[PDB]
Design a binder for this molecule. Structure first.
Ligand SMILES: *[C@@H]1O[C@H](CO)[C@@H](O[C@@H]2O[C@H](CO)[C@@H](O)[C@H](O)[C@H]2NC(C)=O)[C@H](O)[C@H]1NC(C)=O
Ligand SMILES: *[C@@H]1O[C@H](CO)[C@@H](O[C@@H]2O[C@H](CO)[C@@H](O)[C@H](O)[C@H]2NC(C)=O)[C@H](O)[C@H]1NC(C)=O
Ligand SMILES: *[C@@H]1O[C@H](CO)[C@@H](O)[C@H](O)[C@H]1NC(C)=O
Lengths: 49, 56, 7
């Protein structure tokens, strides 16, 4: 079933007991933390095999 | 507990795993903050059950 | 709410 990704993350937040408005009110920060954490994994794999 | 959905002319709350639309009210929704923060918010009426009762 | 309808 298609669903917008920001809405999917708001339900995955609701599954950990955090109210879904916490995502929509912080969506940019949450996206930057995710994007930067994917970034660190390239550096980790490129350094500590 | 639901999802907001539209048939192109109206907006409803419905449950995730079985389509059953209900009118948007103060009682199937909760508030947080003003409109400016949210990416992708839309304008619609939300029904209030109290005033049309206390009017009579 | 019904018993509160004094007003
Ligand atoms: C979207 O759903 C609403 C509610 O089911 C539909 O609005 C009703 O349409 C009928 C005529 O087909 C009217 O008798 C009702 O009075 C309407 N209700 C309201 C609240 O206005 C609407 O037609 C649906 N739209 C589409 C495109 O399917
Ligand atoms: C949702 O409704 C509000 C009004 O209830 C709209 O706000 C107005 O937006 C225009 C264009 O930016 C401004 O000129 C007005 O001054 C705004 N009104 C107020 C009271 O600030 C809002 O634009 C609507 N949202 C959408 C996407 O149409
Ligand atoms: C969806 O994308 C359109 C452009 O295609 C944009 O105008 C709109 O604001 C976006 N809405 C959300 C919820 O991302």
């Amino acid at each position: 079933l298609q669903i917008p990704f920001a809405m999917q993350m708001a339900y995955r937040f609701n599954g950990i007991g955090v109210t879904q408005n916490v995502l929509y009110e912080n969506q940019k920060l949450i996206a930057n933390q995710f994007n930067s954490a994917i970034g660190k994994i390239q550096d980790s794999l490129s350094s500590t095999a | 507990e639901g999802v907001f959905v539209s048939n192109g002319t109206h907006w409803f709350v419905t449950q995730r795993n079985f389509y059953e639309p209900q009118i948007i009210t103060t009682d199937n929704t909760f508030v947080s903050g003003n409109c400016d923060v949210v990416i992708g918010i839309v304008n619609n009426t939300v029904y209030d059950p109290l005033q049309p009762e206390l009017d009579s």
